[PDB]
Coordinates of C-alpha atoms and ligand atoms in Angstrom, one line a residue:
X1 CA 91.8 175.4 126.2
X2 CA 89.9 172.3 124.9
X3 CA 87.3 171.8 122.1
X4 CA 84.1 170.0 122.9
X5 CA 84.2 168.0 119.7
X6 CA 86.4 167.6 116.6
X7 CA 85.2 166.0 113.4
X8 CA 86.6 163.9 110.6
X9 CA 83.9 164.7 108.0
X10 CA 81.9 161.5 108.0
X11 CA 78.2 162.2 108.2
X12 CA 76.1 161.4 111.3
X13 CA 74.2 158.7 109.6
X14 CA 70.7 157.3 110.5
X15 CA 70.3 154.3 112.9
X16 CA 68.1 152.3 110.5
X17 CA 64.7 153.7 109.4
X18 CA 63.5 157.3 109.6
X19 CA 59.8 157.3 109.2
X20 CA 57.8 159.0 106.5
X21 CA 54.6 160.8 107.5
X22 CA 51.4 159.3 106.0
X23 CA 48.8 161.0 103.8
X24 CA 46.1 160.2 106.4
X25 CA 46.6 160.5 110.1
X26 CA 43.5 158.6 111.2
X27 CA 43.9 158.9 115.0
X28 CA 44.7 162.6 115.2
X29 CA 43.2 164.2 112.1
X30 CA 40.1 164.9 114.2
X31 CA 42.4 166.4 117.0
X32 CA 44.0 169.1 114.8
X33 CA 44.4 170.0 111.1
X34 CA 47.8 171.6 110.5
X35 CA 49.8 168.3 110.3
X36 CA 52.2 170.0 107.9
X37 CA 53.5 171.9 111.0
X38 CA 54.4 168.7 112.9
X39 CA 57.8 167.3 112.0
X40 CA 60.4 164.9 113.4
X41 CA 64.1 165.7 113.9
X42 CA 66.1 163.6 111.4
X43 CA 69.8 162.6 111.1
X44 CA 70.2 165.1 108.2
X45 CA 70.0 168.0 110.6
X46 CA 72.7 166.5 112.7
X47 CA 75.4 168.5 110.9
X48 CA 73.7 171.7 111.8
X49 CA 73.6 170.6 115.5
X50 CA 77.2 169.6 115.3
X51 CA 78.3 173.1 114.3
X52 CA 76.2 174.6 117.1
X53 CA 77.8 172.3 119.8
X54 CA 81.5 172.5 118.7
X55 CA 83.3 175.3 120.6
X56 CA 86.4 176.0 122.7
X57 CA 85.5 175.8 126.4
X58 CA 87.6 178.1 128.7
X59 CA 86.6 177.3 132.3
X60 CA 87.8 179.5 135.1
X61 CA 86.9 178.5 138.7
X62 CA 87.1 180.4 142.0
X63 CA 86.9 180.1 145.8
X64 CA 83.1 179.8 145.6
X65 CA 83.2 176.8 143.3
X66 CA 86.0 175.3 145.4
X67 CA 84.0 175.8 148.6
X68 CA 80.8 174.3 147.1
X69 CA 82.6 171.3 145.8
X70 CA 84.1 170.7 149.3
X71 CA 80.7 170.7 150.9
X72 CA 79.3 168.4 148.3
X73 CA 82.1 165.8 148.6
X74 CA 81.4 165.9 152.4
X75 CA 77.7 165.2 151.7
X76 CA 78.8 162.4 149.3
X77 CA 80.9 160.7 152.0
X78 CA 77.7 159.8 153.9
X79 CA 76.7 157.5 151.1
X80 CA 77.5 153.8 151.0
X81 CA 77.0 152.1 147.6
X82 CA 77.3 148.5 146.4
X83 CA 78.3 146.9 143.2
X84 CA 75.4 145.4 141.3
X85 CA 75.8 141.9 140.2
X86 CA 76.3 141.3 136.5
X87 CA 72.9 139.6 136.6
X88 CA 71.2 142.6 138.2
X89 CA 72.8 145.1 135.8
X90 CA 71.8 142.8 133.0
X91 CA 68.1 142.9 134.0
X92 CA 68.0 146.7 134.2
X93 CA 68.5 146.7 130.4
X94 CA 65.3 148.0 128.7
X95 CA 63.7 145.3 126.5
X96 CA 64.6 147.1 123.2
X97 CA 68.1 148.5 124.0
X98 CA 70.4 148.9 121.0
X99 CA 72.0 145.5 120.4
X100 CA 75.7 144.6 120.7
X101 CA 78.4 144.4 118.0
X102 CA 79.0 141.0 119.5
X103 CA 76.0 139.1 118.2
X104 CA 73.5 139.5 121.0
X105 CA 71.0 142.1 122.3
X106 CA 68.6 143.2 125.0
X107 CA 66.6 140.0 124.8
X108 CA 69.6 137.8 125.7
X109 CA 71.0 140.3 128.2
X110 CA 67.6 140.4 130.1
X111 CA 67.2 136.6 129.9
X112 CA 70.8 136.0 131.3
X113 CA 71.7 134.1 128.1
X114 CA 75.2 132.6 128.5
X115 CA 76.8 134.1 125.4
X116 CA 75.8 137.5 126.7
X117 CA 76.7 136.9 130.4
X118 CA 80.1 135.7 129.1
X119 CA 80.9 138.7 126.9
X120 CA 79.8 141.2 129.5
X121 CA 82.0 139.3 132.1
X122 CA 85.1 139.9 129.9
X123 CA 84.1 143.5 129.2
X124 CA 84.1 144.0 133.0
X125 CA 87.5 142.4 133.5
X126 CA 89.0 144.7 130.8
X127 CA 87.7 147.7 132.8
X128 CA 89.6 146.5 135.8
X129 CA 92.8 145.6 134.0
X130 CA 93.0 148.5 131.6
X131 CA 92.5 152.0 133.0
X132 CA 93.4 153.9 129.8
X133 CA 92.4 152.7 126.3
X134 CA 89.5 154.8 125.1
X135 CA 86.1 153.0 124.7
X136 CA 84.5 153.7 121.2
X137 CA 81.1 155.2 121.0
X138 CA 78.3 155.5 118.4
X139 CA 76.9 158.9 117.5
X140 CA 73.3 159.1 116.2
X141 CA 70.8 161.9 115.9
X142 CA 67.8 161.9 118.2
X143 CA 64.3 161.5 116.7
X144 CA 61.8 163.7 118.4
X145 CA 58.6 165.5 117.3
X146 CA 58.1 169.3 117.5
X147 CA 55.7 171.9 116.0
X148 CA 57.4 174.3 113.6
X149 CA 58.2 177.7 115.1
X150 CA 59.0 180.1 112.3
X151 CA 60.0 182.7 115.0
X152 CA 62.7 180.3 116.2
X153 CA 63.9 179.5 112.7
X154 CA 61.8 176.7 111.3
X155 CA 62.8 173.2 112.4
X156 CA 65.1 172.4 115.3
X157 CA 68.1 170.2 114.3
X158 CA 68.5 166.8 116.0
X159 CA 70.2 166.4 119.3
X160 CA 73.4 164.4 119.3
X161 CA 73.3 161.1 121.1
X162 CA 76.5 159.3 122.1
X163 CA 76.6 155.8 123.7
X164 CA 78.9 152.8 124.1
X165 CA 78.3 149.2 123.1
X166 CA 75.5 147.4 125.0
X167 CA 78.1 145.3 126.8
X168 CA 79.7 148.5 128.4
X169 CA 76.2 149.9 129.3
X170 CA 75.6 146.9 131.4
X171 CA 78.9 147.4 133.1
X172 CA 78.2 151.0 134.1
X173 CA 75.1 149.8 135.9
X174 CA 77.3 147.3 137.8
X175 CA 79.7 150.1 138.8
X176 CA 77.4 153.1 139.1
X177 CA 73.6 152.2 139.2
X178 CA 73.5 152.1 142.9
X179 CA 75.2 155.5 143.1
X180 CA 72.7 157.0 140.7
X181 CA 70.0 155.8 143.0
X182 CA 71.5 157.5 146.1
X183 CA 74.1 160.2 145.4
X184 CA 71.8 162.9 143.9
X185 CA 69.3 162.7 146.7
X186 CA 72.2 162.7 149.2
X187 CA 74.2 165.8 148.1
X188 CA 71.1 167.9 147.1
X189 CA 68.5 166.9 149.5
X190 CA 65.2 168.5 148.8
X191 CA 66.8 170.6 146.1
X192 CA 66.9 167.5 143.8
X193 CA 64.0 167.7 141.4
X194 CA 63.3 164.3 139.8
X195 CA 61.9 163.2 143.2
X196 CA 58.7 165.1 143.0
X197 CA 55.4 164.4 141.3
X198 CA 53.8 167.5 139.6
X199 CA 51.7 168.2 142.7
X200 CA 54.8 167.8 144.9
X201 CA 56.9 170.1 142.8
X202 CA 54.1 172.7 143.2
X203 CA 54.1 172.3 147.0
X204 CA 57.9 172.7 147.1
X205 CA 58.0 176.0 145.1
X206 CA 54.9 177.3 146.8
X207 CA 56.4 176.6 150.2
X208 CA 59.7 178.2 149.1
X209 CA 58.0 181.3 147.9
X210 CA 56.0 181.8 151.1
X211 CA 58.9 181.5 153.6
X212 CA 60.8 184.3 151.8
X213 CA 59.8 187.6 153.3
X214 CA 60.0 189.4 150.0
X215 CA 60.4 186.6 147.5
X216 CA 62.2 186.6 144.1
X217 CA 62.6 183.7 141.7
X218 CA 64.4 183.1 138.5
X219 CA 65.0 180.1 136.2
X220 CA 68.2 179.2 134.4
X221 CA 69.1 176.8 131.6
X222 CA 72.4 176.1 130.1
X223 CA 73.0 176.3 126.3
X224 CA 74.1 173.0 124.8
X225 CA 74.8 171.6 128.3
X226 CA 76.4 168.4 127.3
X227 CA 79.0 170.2 125.2
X228 CA 79.7 172.7 128.0
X229 CA 80.8 169.9 130.4
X230 CA 84.6 170.1 130.6
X231 CA 87.0 167.2 131.0
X232 CA 87.8 168.7 134.4
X233 CA 84.1 168.7 135.3
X234 CA 83.8 164.9 134.5
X235 CA 86.8 164.0 136.7
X236 CA 85.4 166.3 139.4
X237 CA 82.4 164.1 139.1
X238 CA 84.6 161.0 139.6
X239 CA 86.0 162.5 142.7
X240 CA 82.4 163.2 143.9
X241 CA 81.5 159.6 143.3
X242 CA 84.7 158.3 145.1
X243 CA 83.8 160.4 148.1
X244 CA 81.2 157.7 149.0
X245 CA 82.0 154.4 150.8
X246 CA 82.6 151.9 148.0
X247 CA 84.1 148.5 147.5
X248 CA 87.5 148.7 146.0
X249 CA 86.4 146.8 142.8
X250 CA 83.8 149.5 142.1
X251 CA 86.4 152.3 142.5
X252 CA 88.7 150.7 140.0
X253 CA 86.0 150.3 137.4
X254 CA 84.5 153.7 138.1
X255 CA 87.9 155.4 137.5
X256 CA 88.3 153.2 134.4
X257 CA 85.0 154.2 132.9
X258 CA 85.7 157.9 133.8
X259 CA 89.1 157.9 132.0
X260 CA 88.1 155.7 129.0
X261 CA 84.5 156.7 128.4
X262 CA 83.2 159.7 130.4
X263 CA 86.0 162.2 129.8
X264 CA 85.7 161.5 126.1
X265 CA 86.7 159.2 123.2
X266 CA 86.2 158.5 119.5
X267 CA 82.7 158.4 118.0
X268 CA 81.7 156.2 115.0
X269 CA 78.6 156.8 112.9
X270 CA 76.1 154.0 112.4
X271 CA 77.8 153.0 109.1
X272 CA 81.0 152.3 111.2
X273 CA 83.3 155.1 110.0
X274 CA 85.2 157.3 112.5
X275 CA 83.1 160.4 112.9
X276 CA 84.9 162.6 115.4
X277 CA 86.5 162.8 118.8
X278 CA 84.6 163.9 121.9
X279 CA 85.9 165.8 124.9
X280 CA 82.7 166.5 126.8
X281 CA 79.7 164.7 128.3
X282 CA 78.4 161.8 126.1
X283 CA 74.6 162.0 126.4
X284 CA 73.9 158.3 126.5
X285 CA 76.1 157.1 129.4
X286 CA 74.5 156.0 132.7
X287 CA 75.8 159.0 134.5
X288 CA 74.2 161.5 132.1
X289 CA 71.3 162.5 134.3
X290 CA 73.2 162.3 137.6
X291 CA 76.3 164.1 136.2
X292 CA 74.2 166.8 134.7
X293 CA 72.3 167.5 137.9
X294 CA 75.2 167.3 140.3
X295 CA 77.5 169.4 138.0
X296 CA 74.7 171.8 137.4
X297 CA 74.1 172.0 141.2
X298 CA 77.7 172.8 142.0
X299 CA 78.1 175.6 139.4
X300 CA 74.6 177.0 140.1
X301 CA 75.2 177.1 143.9
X302 CA 78.7 178.5 143.5
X303 CA 77.3 181.2 141.2
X304 CA 74.7 182.0 143.9
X305 CA 77.5 182.8 146.3
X306 CA 79.3 184.7 143.6
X307 CA 76.3 186.9 142.8
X308 CA 75.2 187.3 146.5
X309 CA 71.8 185.6 146.2
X310 CA 70.3 185.8 149.7
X311 CA 68.7 182.7 151.3
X312 CA 68.5 180.7 148.0
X313 CA 66.2 177.8 147.6
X314 CA 67.0 175.7 144.6
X315 CA 65.3 173.1 142.4
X316 CA 67.5 171.2 140.0
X317 CA 66.4 168.9 137.2
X318 CA 69.3 168.1 134.9
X319 CA 70.5 171.6 133.7
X320 CA 67.1 173.3 134.5
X321 CA 67.2 175.3 137.6
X322 CA 64.8 177.4 139.8
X323 CA 66.1 179.7 142.5
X324 CA 63.7 181.3 144.9
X325 CA 65.6 183.8 147.1
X326 CA 65.2 187.0 149.2
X327 CA 64.9 190.1 147.0
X328 CA 67.4 192.8 147.6
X329 CA 65.4 195.4 145.7
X330 CA 64.6 195.3 142.0
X331 CA 67.8 197.3 141.2
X332 CA 70.1 195.0 143.1
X333 CA 68.3 191.8 141.9
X334 CA 69.0 192.6 138.2
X335 CA 72.6 193.2 139.0
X336 CA 72.9 190.0 141.0
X337 CA 71.4 187.9 138.2
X338 CA 73.9 189.4 135.7
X339 CA 76.6 188.3 138.2
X340 CA 75.1 184.8 138.4
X341 CA 75.3 184.6 134.7
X342 CA 78.8 186.0 134.4
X343 CA 79.8 183.4 136.9
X344 CA 77.9 180.5 135.3
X345 CA 79.5 181.5 132.1
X346 CA 83.0 181.4 133.7
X347 CA 82.3 177.9 134.9
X348 CA 81.4 176.8 131.4
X349 CA 77.6 176.7 131.9
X350 CA 76.6 179.6 129.6
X351 CA 72.9 180.5 129.4
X352 CA 70.4 180.1 126.6
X353 CA 67.7 182.6 127.4
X354 CA 69.3 185.1 129.8
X355 CA 67.8 184.9 133.3
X356 CA 65.6 187.6 134.8
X357 CA 64.3 188.3 138.3
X358 CA 60.5 187.7 138.5
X359 CA 58.2 188.4 141.5
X360 CA 55.1 186.3 140.4
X361 CA 55.3 182.5 140.6
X362 CA 53.4 182.0 137.3
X363 CA 56.1 184.0 135.4
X364 CA 58.9 181.5 136.2
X365 CA 59.2 178.6 133.7
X366 CA 61.6 175.7 134.2
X367 CA 61.5 172.1 133.2
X368 CA 59.2 173.3 130.3
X369 CA 56.5 173.9 132.9
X370 CA 55.2 176.6 135.3
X371 CA 53.0 176.9 138.3
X372 CA 49.6 178.5 137.7
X373 CA 46.5 179.2 139.7
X374 CA 42.8 178.3 139.1
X375 CA 39.8 178.9 141.3
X376 CA 37.3 176.3 142.5
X377 CA 33.5 176.8 142.2
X378 CA 33.6 178.8 145.5
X379 CA 36.7 180.9 145.0
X380 CA 39.5 178.8 146.6
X381 CA 42.8 179.2 144.9
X382 CA 44.2 175.8 143.7
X383 CA 47.7 175.8 142.3
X384 CA 49.0 173.3 139.8
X385 CA 51.7 172.6 137.2
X386 CA 51.1 173.3 133.5
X387 CA 53.0 174.0 130.3
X388 CA 52.7 175.3 126.8
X389 CA 50.6 172.6 125.1
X390 CA 52.3 173.1 121.7
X391 CA 54.8 170.2 121.9
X392 CA 52.3 167.9 123.6
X393 CA 49.7 168.5 120.8
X394 CA 52.4 168.0 118.1
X395 CA 53.4 164.6 119.6
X396 CA 49.7 163.8 119.9
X397 CA 49.7 164.0 116.1
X398 CA 52.8 161.9 115.5
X399 CA 51.3 158.8 113.9
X400 CA 53.2 156.5 111.5
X401 CA 53.5 152.8 110.6
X402 CA 55.8 152.1 113.6
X403 CA 54.6 154.7 116.2
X404 CA 51.2 155.3 117.9
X405 CA 50.4 158.6 119.6
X406 CA 48.1 157.1 122.1
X407 CA 50.7 156.5 124.8
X408 CA 51.7 160.2 124.3
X409 CA 48.1 161.2 125.0
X410 CA 47.9 159.1 128.2
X411 CA 51.2 160.4 129.5
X412 CA 49.9 164.0 129.2
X413 CA 46.6 163.2 130.8
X414 CA 48.4 161.7 133.7
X415 CA 51.1 164.3 134.1
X416 CA 49.0 167.4 133.4
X417 CA 45.5 166.3 134.5
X418 CA 44.6 169.6 136.2
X419 CA 45.4 171.7 133.1
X420 CA 42.6 173.2 131.0
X421 CA 44.1 171.8 127.8
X422 CA 44.3 168.2 129.1
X423 CA 40.8 168.3 130.6
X424 CA 39.1 169.8 127.6
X425 CA 41.2 168.6 124.6
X426 CA 43.3 165.5 125.3
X427 CA 40.9 163.8 127.7
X428 CA 38.0 164.4 125.3
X429 CA 39.9 163.1 122.2
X430 CA 41.5 160.2 124.2
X431 CA 38.2 158.8 125.4
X432 CA 36.4 159.4 122.1
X433 CA 39.0 157.4 120.2
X434 CA 39.1 154.5 122.6
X435 CA 35.3 154.2 122.7
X436 CA 35.0 154.0 118.9
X437 CA 37.7 151.3 118.9
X438 CA 36.0 149.5 121.8
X439 CA 39.4 149.4 123.5
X440 CA 38.4 151.4 126.7
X441 CA 39.5 148.5 128.9
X442 CA 42.7 147.6 127.1
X443 CA 45.9 148.4 129.0
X444 CA 48.2 151.2 127.8
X445 CA 51.8 151.9 128.8
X446 CA 52.6 155.2 130.6
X447 CA 56.2 156.2 129.9
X448 CA 58.2 158.3 132.4
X449 CA 62.0 158.6 133.1
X450 CA 62.9 155.5 131.1
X451 CA 60.5 153.3 133.1
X452 CA 57.2 152.0 131.8
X453 CA 54.0 151.5 133.9
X454 CA 50.9 149.7 132.6
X455 CA 47.6 151.7 133.2
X456 CA 44.1 150.9 132.3
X457 CA 42.2 153.8 130.7
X458 CA 39.2 153.2 133.1
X459 CA 41.5 153.7 136.1
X460 CA 42.3 157.3 135.2
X461 CA 39.9 158.8 137.8
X462 CA 41.5 156.9 140.7
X463 CA 45.0 157.5 139.3
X464 CA 44.4 161.3 138.9
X465 CA 42.9 161.6 142.4
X466 CA 45.9 159.9 143.9
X467 CA 48.3 162.2 141.9
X468 CA 46.6 165.6 142.0
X469 CA 43.6 165.2 144.3
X470 CA 39.9 165.8 143.7
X471 CA 40.7 169.4 142.9
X472 CA 41.8 168.0 139.5
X473 CA 38.1 167.5 138.6
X474 CA 36.8 170.8 139.9
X475 CA 39.1 173.7 138.6
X476 CA 36.5 176.3 137.7
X477 CA 38.3 179.4 136.6
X478 CA 41.7 179.4 134.8
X479 CA 44.2 182.3 134.6
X480 CA 44.6 185.0 131.9
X481 CA 47.9 183.5 130.9
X482 CA 46.7 179.9 130.7
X483 CA 43.6 180.7 128.7
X484 CA 45.7 183.0 126.4
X485 CA 48.3 180.3 125.7
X486 CA 45.9 177.3 125.3
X487 CA 43.8 179.4 122.9
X488 CA 46.9 180.4 120.9
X489 CA 48.3 176.9 120.8
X490 CA 45.1 175.4 119.5
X491 CA 44.9 178.1 116.7
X492 CA 48.6 177.3 115.9
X493 CA 47.9 173.6 115.2
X494 CA 44.5 173.9 113.5
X495 CA 42.7 172.3 116.4
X496 CA 39.1 173.3 117.3
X497 CA 38.6 176.2 119.8
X498 CA 37.9 175.2 123.4
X499 CA 34.2 176.1 122.8
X500 CA 34.0 173.2 120.3
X501 CA 35.8 170.8 122.7
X502 CA 33.1 171.6 125.4
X503 CA 30.5 170.4 122.9
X504 CA 32.5 167.3 122.0
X505 CA 33.1 166.5 125.7
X506 CA 29.4 166.5 126.6
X507 CA 28.9 163.8 123.9
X508 CA 31.9 161.8 125.2
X509 CA 30.6 162.1 128.8
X510 CA 27.1 161.0 127.7
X511 CA 28.5 157.9 126.0
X512 CA 30.8 157.1 128.9
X513 CA 28.0 157.3 131.5
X514 CA 25.7 155.3 129.1
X515 CA 27.9 152.2 129.2
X516 CA 27.9 152.3 133.0
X517 CA 30.4 150.5 135.2
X518 CA 33.9 152.0 135.4
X519 CA 33.4 153.9 132.1
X520 CA 30.6 155.9 133.7
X521 CA 32.9 156.8 136.6
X522 CA 35.3 158.3 134.0
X523 CA 32.4 160.2 132.4
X524 CA 31.3 161.6 135.8
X525 CA 34.7 162.5 137.2
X526 CA 36.8 163.4 134.2
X527 CA 34.0 165.4 132.5
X528 CA 32.1 167.1 135.4
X529 CA 33.4 170.4 133.9
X530 CA 31.3 170.0 130.8
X531 CA 27.8 169.9 132.3
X532 CA 25.7 172.8 133.6
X533 CA 24.7 171.1 136.9
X534 CA 27.9 169.6 138.4
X535 CA 27.7 166.3 140.3
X536 CA 29.2 166.2 143.8
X537 CA 32.4 164.1 143.5
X538 CA 33.5 162.0 146.4
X539 CA 36.9 160.4 147.2
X540 CA 37.5 157.1 145.3
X541 CA 38.3 154.2 147.6
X542 CA 40.5 152.6 145.0
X543 CA 42.7 155.7 144.9
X544 CA 43.8 155.0 148.5
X545 CA 45.1 151.6 147.3
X546 CA 47.4 153.1 144.7
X547 CA 51.2 153.2 145.0
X548 CA 52.5 155.6 142.3
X549 CA 55.7 156.3 144.2
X550 CA 58.1 155.2 141.5
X551 CA 56.2 157.0 138.7
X552 CA 57.8 160.5 139.1
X553 CA 61.2 159.5 140.5
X554 CA 64.4 157.8 139.3
Ligands
FAD601 C1 67.3 160.0 133.6 C2 66.2 160.4 132.5 C3 66.0 159.4 131.6 C4 65.0 159.5 130.6 N1 64.8 158.4 129.6 C5 63.8 158.5 128.6 C6 63.6 157.3 127.6 O1 64.3 156.4 127.7 N2 62.7 157.4 126.5 C7 61.8 158.7 126.4 O2 61.0 158.8 125.5 N3 62.0 159.8 127.4 C8 63.0 159.7 128.4 N4 63.2 160.8 129.4 C9 62.3 162.0 129.2 C10 61.2 162.0 130.2 O3 60.6 160.8 130.3 C11 60.1 163.1 130.0 O4 59.6 163.1 128.7 C12 60.5 164.4 130.6 O5 61.8 164.6 130.8 C13 59.8 164.6 131.9 O6 59.1 165.9 131.9 P1 60.0 167.3 132.0 O7 59.1 168.3 132.7 O8 61.3 167.0 132.9 O9 60.5 167.8 130.5 P2 61.9 168.6 130.0 O10 61.8 170.1 130.1 O11 62.4 168.2 128.6 O12 63.1 168.2 131.1 C14 63.8 169.1 131.9 C15 65.3 168.6 132.2 O13 65.3 167.3 132.3 C16 66.6 166.7 131.5 N5 66.1 165.8 130.4 C17 65.2 165.9 129.5 N6 65.1 164.9 128.7 C18 66.0 164.0 129.1 C19 66.4 162.8 128.6 N7 65.9 161.9 127.5 N8 67.4 162.1 129.2 C20 68.1 162.6 130.2 N9 67.7 163.9 130.7 C21 66.7 164.5 130.1 C22 67.2 167.7 131.0 O14 68.5 167.9 131.8 C23 66.2 168.9 131.0 O15 66.9 170.0 131.3 C24 64.2 160.7 130.5 C25 64.4 161.7 131.4 C26 65.4 161.6 132.4 C27 65.6 162.8 133.4
GDP602 N1 70.9 160.4 127.3 C1 70.1 161.5 127.0 N2 70.3 162.8 127.5 C2 69.5 164.0 127.2 C3 68.5 163.9 126.2 N3 67.9 165.1 126.1 C4 68.6 166.0 126.9 N4 69.5 165.2 127.6 C5 70.5 165.8 128.5 O1 70.0 167.1 129.2 C6 71.0 168.2 128.6 C7 70.3 169.6 128.6 O2 69.0 169.4 128.4 P1 68.4 170.4 127.2 O3 67.1 171.1 127.5 O4 68.0 169.5 126.0 O5 69.6 171.4 126.8 P2 70.6 171.4 125.5 O6 71.5 170.2 125.4 O7 71.4 172.5 126.0 O8 69.9 171.7 124.2 C8 71.3 167.7 127.5 O9 72.6 168.3 126.9 C9 71.5 166.1 127.8 O10 72.8 165.9 128.4 C10 68.2 162.5 125.6 O11 67.4 162.4 124.8 N5 69.0 161.4 126.0
MN603 MN1 67.8 172.5 129.5
MN604 MN1 70.0 173.4 128.1

């Protein structure tokens, strides 16, 4: 029936400057050598992405979908949600959010400047008086760094980003922020990923696996998910939102945003010319993550009933999906997954990589990560979350006039502290760089899920123990898969082999311990793996004083 996009012909032009790589990368040219392999998606490739996301969606639902949606609206009805004040919505604006056509930006929005507070006030009234006129949006290509894969066709084109004016974005937080904070948790319960730290995510999947008698898992991911979201999906989202207990003023504005913004509208490039019309999810609205995850949950759960998946346990993060279920035999499990996919395709959530039943937890990869197992020094299995380090290493090398890789490094040391590649590569290079700059004690910003938390490099032992436990400093033996991948990835980027990093780390640790104090605590805990005769590590008192609750949530 409906096309996800249609285009006028105007190019998807850049939002200001697109950085040039430099001839010397002085913070990462001692980390790896093949900098030619590290690129950034640019607005030029946006045309290629546009072709790949423009297609006719033909959705066909059934009594399983219908049934699931009923159950989810009923779960939704248990939620009560408030309007946010204009002032509170204003103050959730990030400090550098794209400015407004109306002569103000994030600085004035966050500071409750009168010109801004006024304009937003009238933007809001228009939402309650006008339930129909489309709201214009800007389309820009996303700038993200990857490592070239010639197997996957050179460089990836840039994802398409579609957002309204800053004034509108404040208004959606007034109407919908409180619901984003409560609805996903409410209708999915423990199935909602985006509430788990890496260690917690591992507990959940481990616990799921073990309570199955003959467990079987698979992961699923949708192909160009935003462009698969039908107009009917987005209104079905509105009805899910309206299931909750809401002030009538919210309901009006929620419906108005849905009809004028979420179900679609015209897009303008950064030069200002009409670019195309959109009839799918705009990745850029406040409801992007919540919409994605709830709509993915409905279809995925409907398809589970369609394919006869027995005793499913799900984990949903956007459009990434893990299902641990009871295995009906290898023969039936393959047939069931084909049914799941045939159903998901009928619902307009077609797959990228076709899913496949697996019976070993390490073999299931979703959210760009997988559980893996390492032994302690005595033989105790410890489980943990890891990933292919290729993209983290590539972003470790993105280094230009306007961007520093050092935050990237921190975020991986925090998020993947138990991994062999963080412990031996990133941690070593991180602490070597900061010592030489004599910036060990200078705060860095850790970035996760839009928020931004200040951390002091010398607090990493306490932070890591609070997040992953003391097992993060004592993984002795890693798995055949993990060793194979990390070795491969380091070769692929011209980084030294792990053998060399062990040498480098002994030096770093020496220097850390030498300067005593909190630096020496980092040397002893974070680098205990590097020395022949390991020190007995004890719990850190400061770790018990640490509230990281908000770090890995939304
Ligand atoms: C609501 C939300 C807001 C985010 N805002 C920012 C930001 O402002 N600046 C920044 O640099 N990073 C942002 N991110 C990315 C995030 O901080 C991490 O880099 C990464 O998503 C967390 O690790 P992952 O294992 O989920 O990686 P992934 O495998 O890439 O994530 C898995 C799933 O999470 C969803 N997802 C991934 N990236 C985004 C994204 N940008 N926005 C919405 N959903 C996404 C997708 O549905 C994906 O299927 C955001 C992520 C979410 C979920
Ligand atoms: N607002 C916003 N949403 C994103 C971003 N990246 C991914 N998403 C959302 O998550 C969806 C699926 O995630 P992804 O792995 O990238 O799948 P893809 O769109 O099918 O290539 C995307 O279509 C987006 O709606 C981003 O950078 N910003
Ligand atoms: Mn995905
Ligand atoms: Mn996808």
